[PDB]
Design a protein around this nucleic acid. Structure first.
Ligand SMILES: [Mg+2]
Ligand SMILES: [Mg+2]
Ligand SMILES: [Mg+2]
Ligand SMILES: [Mg+2]
Ligand SMILES: [Mg+2]
Ligand SMILES: [Mg+2]
Ligand SMILES: [Mg+2]
Ligand SMILES: [Mg+2]
Ligand SMILES: [Mg+2]
Ligand SMILES: [Mg+2]
Ligand SMILES: [Mg+2]
Ligand SMILES: [Mg+2]
Ligand SMILES: [Mg+2]
Ligand SMILES: [Mg+2]
Ligand SMILES: [Mg+2]
Ligand SMILES: [Mg+2]
Ligand SMILES: [Mg+2]
Ligand SMILES: [Mg+2]
Ligand SMILES: [Mg+2]
Ligand SMILES: [Mg+2]
Ligand SMILES: [Mg+2]
Ligand SMILES: [Mg+2]
Ligand SMILES: [Mg+2]
Ligand SMILES: [Mg+2]
Ligand SMILES: [Mg+2]
Ligand SMILES: [Mg+2]
Ligand SMILES: [Mg+2]
Ligand SMILES: [Mg+2]
Ligand SMILES: [Mg+2]
Ligand SMILES: [Mg+2]
Ligand SMILES: [Mg+2]
Ligand SMILES: [Mg+2]
Ligand SMILES: [Mg+2]
Ligand SMILES: [Mg+2]
Ligand SMILES: [Mg+2]
Ligand SMILES: [Mg+2]
Ligand SMILES: [Mg+2]
Ligand SMILES: [Mg+2]
Ligand SMILES: [Mg+2]
Ligand SMILES: [Mg+2]
Ligand SMILES: [Mg+2]
Ligand SMILES: [Mg+2]
Ligand SMILES: [Mg+2]
Ligand SMILES: [Mg+2]
Ligand SMILES: [Mg+2]
Ligand SMILES: [Mg+2]
Ligand SMILES: [Mg+2]
Ligand SMILES: [Mg+2]
Ligand SMILES: [Mg+2]
Ligand SMILES: [Mg+2]
Ligand SMILES: [Mg+2]
Ligand SMILES: [Mg+2]
Ligand SMILES: [Mg+2]
Ligand SMILES: [Mg+2]
Ligand SMILES: [Mg+2]
Ligand SMILES: [Mg+2]
Ligand SMILES: [Mg+2]
Ligand SMILES: [Mg+2]
Ligand SMILES: [Mg+2]
Ligand SMILES: [Mg+2]
Ligand SMILES: [Mg+2]
Ligand SMILES: [Mg+2]
Ligand SMILES: [Mg+2]
Ligand SMILES: [Mg+2]
Ligand SMILES: [Mg+2]
Ligand SMILES: [Mg+2]
Ligand SMILES: [Mg+2]
Ligand SMILES: [Mg+2]
Ligand SMILES: [Mg+2]
Ligand SMILES: [Mg+2]
Ligand SMILES: [Mg+2]
Ligand SMILES: [Mg+2]
Ligand SMILES: [Mg+2]
Ligand SMILES: [Mg+2]
Ligand SMILES: [Mg+2]
Ligand SMILES: [Mg+2]
Ligand SMILES: [Mg+2]
Ligand SMILES: [Mg+2]
Ligand SMILES: [Mg+2]
Ligand SMILES: [Mg+2]
Ligand SMILES: [Mg+2]
Ligand SMILES: [Mg+2]
Ligand SMILES: [Mg+2]
Ligand SMILES: [Mg+2]
Ligand SMILES: [Mg+2]
Ligand SMILES: [Mg+2]
Ligand SMILES: [Mg+2]
Ligand SMILES: [Mg+2]
Ligand SMILES: [Mg+2]
Ligand SMILES: [Mg+2]
Ligand SMILES: [Mg+2]
Ligand SMILES: [Mg+2]
Ligand SMILES: [Mg+2]
Ligand SMILES: [Mg+2]
Ligand SMILES: [Mg+2]
Ligand SMILES: [Mg+2]
Ligand SMILES: [Mg+2]
Ligand SMILES: [Mg+2]
Ligand SMILES: [Mg+2]
Ligand SMILES: [Mg+2]
Ligand SMILES: [Mg+2]
Ligand SMILES: [Mg+2]
Ligand SMILES: [Mg+2]
Ligand SMILES: [Mg+2]
Lengths: 275, 88
RNA sequence: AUCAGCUUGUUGGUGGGGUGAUGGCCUACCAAGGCGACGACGGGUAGCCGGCCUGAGAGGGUGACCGGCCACACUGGGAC
RNA sequence: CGGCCAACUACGUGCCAGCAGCCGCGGUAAUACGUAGGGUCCGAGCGUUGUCCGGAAUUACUGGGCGUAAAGAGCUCGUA
RNA sequence: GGGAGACUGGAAUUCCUGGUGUAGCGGUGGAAUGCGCAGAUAUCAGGAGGAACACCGGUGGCGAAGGCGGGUCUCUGGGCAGUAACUGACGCUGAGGAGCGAAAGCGUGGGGAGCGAACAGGAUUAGAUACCCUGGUAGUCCACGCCGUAAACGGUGGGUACUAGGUGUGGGUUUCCUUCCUUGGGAUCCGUGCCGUAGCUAACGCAUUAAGUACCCCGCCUGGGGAGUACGGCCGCAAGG
RNA sequence: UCGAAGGUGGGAUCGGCGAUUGGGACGAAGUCGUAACAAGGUAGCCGUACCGGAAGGUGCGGCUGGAUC
RNA sequence: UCUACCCAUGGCCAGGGUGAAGCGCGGGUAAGACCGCGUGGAGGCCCGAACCCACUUAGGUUGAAGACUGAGGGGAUGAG
RNA sequence: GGGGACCCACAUGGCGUGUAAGCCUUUACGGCCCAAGCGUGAGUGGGUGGCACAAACCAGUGAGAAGCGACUGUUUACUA
């Protein structure tokens, strides 16, 4: 759950963490690890592509079976629900009957011992990936794909995931966490159940070291920025810039969504906030 | 709530004889089985205050019965508490 | 209790000194407890009693005089 | 010397000067203010003042109540 | 309708989408701020989301008290009648202590249809920082914690024994006119309304579900303000208690 | 060794005073107001939160110590 | 090849204290919460050298040095 | 605020280590103890010397208020 840390030092007074009692193994599988490195917020070209992030704690990579489609009709027990920091959620390894173990996203309330099926015959216990032909309308879903068989991309937020609304014709309607409705094929791949670590939103950061570890760099406010560096720069004292806030990269607040996407016709309306 | 099968099993198995039912031994046995079972239930169901009232009432009743057993005979009290494995 | 914990010779035992007399009265050595919500330790007041006044009684108030003790002798100590 | 409380009339100023333990007494005709008489009480003492009890069953053990005047804690389990 | 979790239903409001359909719709003691001519109101079809369950529904049931009601499942407490098998003084109340607790308020993270403090306008008045109208932010919903106060009222602590009745309701045992249908008649215990004796009370009034006559323990009160306030102590992150 | 007096240093209690401020009661009479007592012209009151010179107003929940029908 | 940032691979931090969760025992409960006792060394923790900085002062300022030296000064298991 | 040096006694004391030897066996580069030997802090008494017993080096000044900034951190290499 959530465990709050006692104030031993003035720095870690407010630090509270979601204790990971949901851990079973501590040393990740060495076979599936691929060579990875912190890119430092920089491309191969050497320029800093995005500031406020980079540096920190070098970490490893592991392949997740996001698009599980190659093998079907075989069951798998939950091997060990381990901790992968490269995601907000957790990964629970599976012993499939063919002996080919792949990592998958651990759904909410998953504990070691449940049997998971991936295919048409799969039931409604969480972790079962199956096309929309075999799912009731109205069930909460996660790790949702966009086409019948091109790899799953969406619905992997910890705690709130996409909810299926209804099927009409050959197009299916999906409700977004933002409260929006997206039209998607009735043959895409989607799983059942919410994603775990819902209590992760109750994490309290704590200090700056954790944050350089996590990746982000300290944020430099524009009002003290130099005027050449930023439109908010300059001033003798504290000033807001004398104009509406603007990213120093030229454009102010506003529309950024370029229309006319191939899935733009597959969207009914855009998000509305604070209702 | 206990039903006929296990309840008659308990009353006989902790009974002094095959006919007596209201003996303090059988009474404490029924109270203990009830409290462990329904405490297991309340480990899942948290905010059942109306049932925690039953917990407290049955526990005070139990405490009175155990006090009576200790008063009437130390040996039987010790035998009962040792056979059920509790603290007091 | 608009005072909840107090105490370290403090508590208990043994061995020594001590005093007219027993005794942590004093010393050494052993153990950790005694007193505590049937009001301890703290705070304010005040000499106690036979008596006096009041009240049918219960009770309340009080310690003039006398008398039975207690404590003091400008303040604090000590000893022959 | 108004009623509590046994003892009243006249004369002098009228919301002034003043009385007083509770109620309370004077705004031109006061048995309540001041003076006269007259009467009452007490008396070598007479009142004022302060402390204490009684009435105070007004801390109710004898001897009070808790619907509205003051009061049933919000209600249970339950240790001493 | 005792409590908790999950699943599920319909009506209604609002919003969105698409027809039809035209200059008004909403409003009060009267009118104007409000939305329309960019197509409102009305009305049909569909969808979305949140809250709460109209009738049954009552001076009726349960819970110790706050309180509790759309269905369904799951688990569970309390109470009642008969046989009375068994335990054989285990009963009661309970200072300090501990647990539950209307609404509002606070933190974190979600939800948020309707309603609605605060705040804007429009209206009345000499005056409105109100009563009225149009809007609507907390909150009202969910989970975890908190505060622990109400005219928290039956303004009456609990338990036991006794003391005339009449009239309704609910639950269960029996017996007899006996169709053996019948609130038929009778006996019994528990709960809950109304009116009434003796009695009590200053009166209103209570009257077997006592304020009647007693027993056991517990809290509270000693003229009105000051004042349920200052200081001190305890709890609470704070409001505060 | 003990030992009264004296001096070092910080904790409690009783206090006395203290600019100014907060609150209360008594004066009498004046302005601002209509709050409550009759369905007091918005039924009252209680707990609570917000608002306003002021009595008060509103929201939510609770009682009738509320009158008509 | 200094300095700013990042990337990958190595290395560095003498010594001394503070004592979280967890763990077992004895109380507390029916289960808790909680209460003490023994292990724990978690900490952008503490004191303090190597190391990295540059707060004060003096000297120097045609210096030993185109930014130091000498006394003190801060971090010193980490945003190093 | 107190003690801190040296010597003696308590003391052939306590502690660690561990041989000979002893105990044992799945007999081996084996477990238990361990006279002897080695190392060793701590305290209480008695006495002694100096002005001074952490005597050198090394090695926190402390306390009371109020402003800003929550704190550790980074920066104007070479005026802050
Ligand atoms: Mg913090
Ligand atoms: Mg990799
Ligand atoms: Mg290029
Ligand atoms: Mg950024
Ligand atoms: Mg790096
Ligand atoms: Mg993670
Ligand atoms: Mg910024
Ligand atoms: Mg700047
Ligand atoms: Mg520019
Ligand atoms: Mg530049
Ligand atoms: Mg500037
Ligand atoms: Mg300026
Ligand atoms: Mg802008
Ligand atoms: Mg959206
Ligand atoms: Mg049952
Ligand atoms: Mg002796
Ligand atoms: Mg002797
Ligand atoms: Mg003695
Ligand atoms: Mg001795
Ligand atoms: Mg006497
Ligand atoms: Mg008397
Ligand atoms: Mg008397
Ligand atoms: Mg006396
Ligand atoms: Mg005499
Ligand atoms: Mg004598
Ligand atoms: Mg003397
Ligand atoms: Mg003397
Ligand atoms: Mg007279
Ligand atoms: Mg007379
Ligand atoms: Mg006259
Ligand atoms: Mg005369
Ligand atoms: Mg008297
Ligand atoms: Mg009596
Ligand atoms: Mg009385
Ligand atoms: Mg009253
Ligand atoms: Mg009361
Ligand atoms: Mg109260
Ligand atoms: Mg629940
Ligand atoms: Mg339409
Ligand atoms: Mg419509
Ligand atoms: Mg909504
Ligand atoms: Mg028998
Ligand atoms: Mg009982
Ligand atoms: Mg009791
Ligand atoms: Mg009791
Ligand atoms: Mg008590
Ligand atoms: Mg009590
Ligand atoms: Mg509690
Ligand atoms: Mg609690
Ligand atoms: Mg509410
Ligand atoms: Mg609430
Ligand atoms: Mg608030
Ligand atoms: Mg909250
Ligand atoms: Mg929130
Ligand atoms: Mg509204
Ligand atoms: Mg309103
Ligand atoms: Mg506006
Ligand atoms: Mg207004
Ligand atoms: Mg109260
Ligand atoms: Mg109630
Ligand atoms: Mg009561
Ligand atoms: Mg009674
Ligand atoms: Mg009856
Ligand atoms: Mg009569
Ligand atoms: Mg009478
Ligand atoms: Mg009657
Ligand atoms: Mg009665
Ligand atoms: Mg009475
Ligand atoms: Mg007042
Ligand atoms: Mg008071
Ligand atoms: Mg205080
Ligand atoms: Mg004072
Ligand atoms: Mg003063
Ligand atoms: Mg006036
Ligand atoms: Mg009025
Ligand atoms: Mg009015
Ligand atoms: Mg009114
Ligand atoms: Mg009113
Ligand atoms: Mg109020
Ligand atoms: Mg209001
Ligand atoms: Mg209400
Ligand atoms: Mg009335
Ligand atoms: Mg430690
Ligand atoms: Mg712990
Ligand atoms: Mg230092
Ligand atoms: Mg320098
Ligand atoms: Mg110079
Ligand atoms: Mg030179
Ligand atoms: Mg140079
Ligand atoms: Mg230096
Ligand atoms: Mg110096
Ligand atoms: Mg240093
Ligand atoms: Mg540090
Ligand atoms: Mg650091
Ligand atoms: Mg050996
Ligand atoms: Mg041998
Ligand atoms: Mg062996
Ligand atoms: Mg000397
Ligand atoms: Mg610093
Ligand atoms: Mg810094
Ligand atoms: Mg720099
Ligand atoms: Mg500089
Ligand atoms: Mg520099
Ligand atoms: Mg500088």
């Amino acid at each position: 759950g959530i465990r709050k840390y006692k104030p031993t030092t003035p720095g870690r007074r407010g630090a509270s963490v979601s204790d990971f009692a949901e851990i079973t193994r501590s040393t990740p599988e060495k076979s599936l690890v691929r060579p990875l490195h912190g890119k430092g917020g920089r491309n191969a070209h050497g320029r800093i592509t995005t500031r406020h992030k980079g540096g920190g704690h070098k970490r490893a990579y592991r392949v997740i079976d996001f698009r599980r489609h190659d093998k079907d009709g075989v069951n798998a027990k939950v091997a060990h629900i381990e901790y992968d920091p490269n995601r907000t959620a957790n990964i629970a390894l599976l012993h499939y009957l063919d002996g080919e173990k792949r990592y998958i996203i651990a759904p909410q309330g998953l504990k070691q011992g449940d049997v998971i099926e991936s295919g048409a015959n799969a039931d409604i216990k969480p972790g079962n990936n199956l096309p929309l032909r075999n799912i009731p309308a109205g069930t909460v879903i996660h790790a949702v794909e966009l086409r019948p068989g091109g790899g799953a991309k969406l619905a992997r937020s910890a705690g709130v995931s996409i909810q299926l609304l209804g099927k009409e014709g050959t197009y299916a309607a999906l409700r977004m966490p933002s409260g929006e409705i997206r039209r998607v094929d009735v043959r895409c791949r989607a799983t059942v159940g919410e994603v775990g670590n819902a209590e992760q939103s109750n994490i309290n950061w704590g200090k700056a070291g954790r944050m350089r570890w996590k990746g982000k760099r300290p944020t430099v406010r524009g009002v003290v920025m130099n005027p050449v560096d930023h439109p908010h720069g300059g001033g003798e004292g504290k000033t807001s810039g004398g104009r509406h806030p603007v990213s120093p990269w030229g454009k102010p607040e506003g529309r950024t969504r370029k229309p006319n996407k191939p899935s733009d016709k597959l969207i009914v309306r855009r998000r509305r906030t604070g209702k | 709530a206990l039903t006929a099968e296990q309840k008659k099993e308990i009353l006989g198995q902790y009974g002094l004889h095959d006919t007596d039912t209201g003996s303090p031994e059988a009474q404490v046995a029924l109270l203990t089985k009830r409290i462990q079972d329904l405490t297991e239930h309340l480990k899942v169901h948290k905010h059942d205050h109306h049932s925690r009232r039953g917990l407290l009432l049955l526990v005070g009743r139990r405490r009175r019965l155990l006090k009576y057993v200790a008063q009437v005979d130390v040996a039987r009290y010790r035998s009962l508490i040792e056979r059920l494995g509790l603290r007091r």
